[PDB]
């Protein structure tokens, strides 16, 4: 099986080709994480992914999406991801951590308590900020604040000490969330970006505050460890070719700048848009970027069954499959996959004292 | 569905009838339990069982079946399963424990490890004791040294201090392991106690063991949380109407001595049987000790699909349905039986974390 075979990339080996995607939790408190963390991510370890990518954790408070968010702002956040770090080598998996930043998406109720934005007068809130004074909409309707220059370099610096503490964690792979409309991603789009100084504008300028993110923490990330980003390549907005042109053309720079891999997912910059949700519906985007860009890629949104994960594989659309809610479902789906595939030994997917009993 | 309704038994109410049964995992060091055991529990609770039950702790160090088999003989011991109990709450299910005596098992190798009796010489091995010197056989041959009265006093004594460390260390549930060959269970057994005092012979000197060590345990044990016993019923060994009605009859006497579940299970004292494992096999038999001796009760051995459980349940064959493989295959076993049985928001078998995005 495809899926079951082993990757690898710069110093590190994937046992398999499953990836957990990062998923929030909306569980720790002012950006701490704890035991909800620690058993949640374990427990998905044992279950015999690859690789197990930690949810969105914010560089900054202000960079939480919502009050449950995990932080690395600090070194003592920092070292409550050491255990969990360690739990997950033990189990074979390769532990990430995806560093995020939500720009004006920024101060949100957790989903199952509204998913909007914190009302003016609730204590929990804070002031969002972004590239430009332009609300999301919809149900994020608050207007940031237009970051200043110091406040870029404040930001890139927060990115830069996230990296060195997510590397002194033990992490073995960093993904740079520049996704979702999330900060980074909301600097690239001409919809959120009218800025008319060095970070706005042209390709180069809307290209210059990731670009620069990731030279900066290149500098901190060990060249032997995987340094990878997600980014939206398309929006679904009507300005589709023009856009994935655009992406593909940073995906080049990203790569020229020591990028390893990429996470290609959609932009959700806007909230008027019409994305055409489906089984493996990313699949044609993620190839043709892993193809004109010349990057290995990972994607998600619908390849959660073993046959569509394999499928993408053999047809090299993807480097790694990245499964998420399948593996809130059932945290041993990397089990259930290699039953499904017929691969030998399949309950071997699983430590020992599960995997004699399912033989 | 009646799987998924409450039950109430003295002072504690199950959130449903899916209970998980003791199952050893071999991975304590010198009996203490660690982060294996911590994580292992801590996700089964989230999966949304009403009830999860602690393998086979061992009241003493002999008493353990393997060098990796969990241990509360000291106080130190039962400190350590502190953090997972307390965990097992945070999910909203019951945590129990199974508390053991290895008998003439004990000294064995882990099951993946040869399943059978220690060499004479590997330094991890040790002496088992049993009411008689007489070998299991097959893979069992060591012959045990036969106890002494000081030894049942000794070994009494163990499981009360057991059963008070348990109730300290905050279980609000206890199980009594008098099943599967183990120490009760060869005490009651005609096959393996050949004693001419007080604890073998008759029908009562046989009881004797059993009945003695759950008043015993009965006297630290809170009259006000669930007290119960893994009794093996019958062996399959040609003898099952007499040793059944022996064994109805036991488990009227261990209703009468304050006993609030018994779960029914196989003997497996002998190595010479003929089990007709199937789907549900057991249900015929629990039906019967339920009826006949008027007490609740659980089984297991082959009730893990949802169809099984809910089959057992209306027919009231069990009051809990145990389900064992199935979650080590998948900890979240509870909400794939909620979809199966068609529960109203099934998702939320499971925490919000989870439960929002399964929808
Ligand atoms: C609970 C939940 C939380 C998520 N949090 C993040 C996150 O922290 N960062 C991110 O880039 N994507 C996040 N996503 C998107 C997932 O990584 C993934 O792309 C999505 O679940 C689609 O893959 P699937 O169809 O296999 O679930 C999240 C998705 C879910 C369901
Ligand atoms: C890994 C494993 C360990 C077990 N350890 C114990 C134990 O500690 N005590 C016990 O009474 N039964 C033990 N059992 C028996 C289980 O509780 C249960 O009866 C058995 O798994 C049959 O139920 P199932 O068909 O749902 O798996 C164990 C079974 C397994 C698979
Ligand atoms: O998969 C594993 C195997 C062993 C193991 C052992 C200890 C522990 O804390 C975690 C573990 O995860
Ligand atoms: O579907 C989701 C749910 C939460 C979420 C949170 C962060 C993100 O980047 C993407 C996300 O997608
Ligand atoms: O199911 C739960 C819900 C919340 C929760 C919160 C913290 C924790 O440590 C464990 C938990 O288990
Ligand atoms: O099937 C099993 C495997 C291990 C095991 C261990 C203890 C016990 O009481 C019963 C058991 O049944």
């Known amino acids: 099986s495809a899926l079951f075979e082993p990757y ?24 701490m994480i704890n035991d909800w963390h620690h058993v949640h991510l374990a427990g998905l370890a044992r279950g015999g992914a690859g690789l197990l990518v930690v949810e969105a954790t914010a560089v900054a408070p202000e960079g939480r ?15 409550a991801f050491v255990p969990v770090v360690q739990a997950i080598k033990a189990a074979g ?57 110091d406040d870029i370099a404040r930001v890139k610096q927060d990115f830069v000490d996230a990296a060195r503490r997510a590397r002194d964690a ?9 996704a979702h409309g999330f900060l980074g991603q909301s600097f690239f789009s001409e919809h959120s970006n009218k800025r008319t100084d060095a970070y706005g504008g042209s390709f180069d300028n809307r290209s210059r505050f990731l670009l ?42 990203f790569k020229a700048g020591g990028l390893d891999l990429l996470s290609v997912s959609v932009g959700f910059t806007i909230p008027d848009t019409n994305i055409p949700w489906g089984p493996a519906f990313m699949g044609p985007i993620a190839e043709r970027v892993r193809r004109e ?16 994960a394999e499928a ?4 090299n ?24 595939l017929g691969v030998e030994k399949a309950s071997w997917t699983l430590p020992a004292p599960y995997a004699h009993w399912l033989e």
């Open 93 to 149: 998996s390769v532990p990430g951590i995806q560093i995020a930043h939500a720009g004006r998406k920024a101060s949100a109720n957790r989903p199952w308590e509204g998913d909007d934005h914190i009302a003016a007068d609730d204590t929990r809130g804070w002031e969002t900020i972004a590239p430009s004074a332009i609300a999301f909409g919809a149900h994020l309707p608050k207007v940031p604040r237009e970051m200043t220059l």
């Open 317 to 340: 659309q993807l480097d790694l499959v990245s499964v998420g809610r399948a593996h809130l479902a059932d945290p041993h789906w990397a089990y259930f996959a290699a039953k499904e």
């Open 312 to 315: 993408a594989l053999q047809a």
């Open 65 to 79: 999406i919502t009050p449950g968010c995990a932080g690395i702002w600090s070194d003592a956040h920092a070292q």
């Open 8 to 31: 690898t990339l710069k110093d590190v080996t994937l046992r398999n080709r499953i990836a957990i995607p990062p998923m929030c939790q909306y569980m720790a408190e002012d950006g």
């Open 293 to 308: 860009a010349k990057l290995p890629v990972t994607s998600a949104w619908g390849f959660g069954t073993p046959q569509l």
């Open 212 to 253: 620069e993110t990731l030279a900066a923490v290149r500098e901190v990330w060990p060249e032997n460890l995987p340094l990878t980003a997600r980014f939206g390549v398309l929006e679904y907005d009507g300005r589709d070719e023009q856009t994935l042109e655009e992406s593909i053309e940073l995906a080049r720079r």
């Open 170 to 178: 033990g992490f073995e792979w960093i993904e740079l969330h520049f």
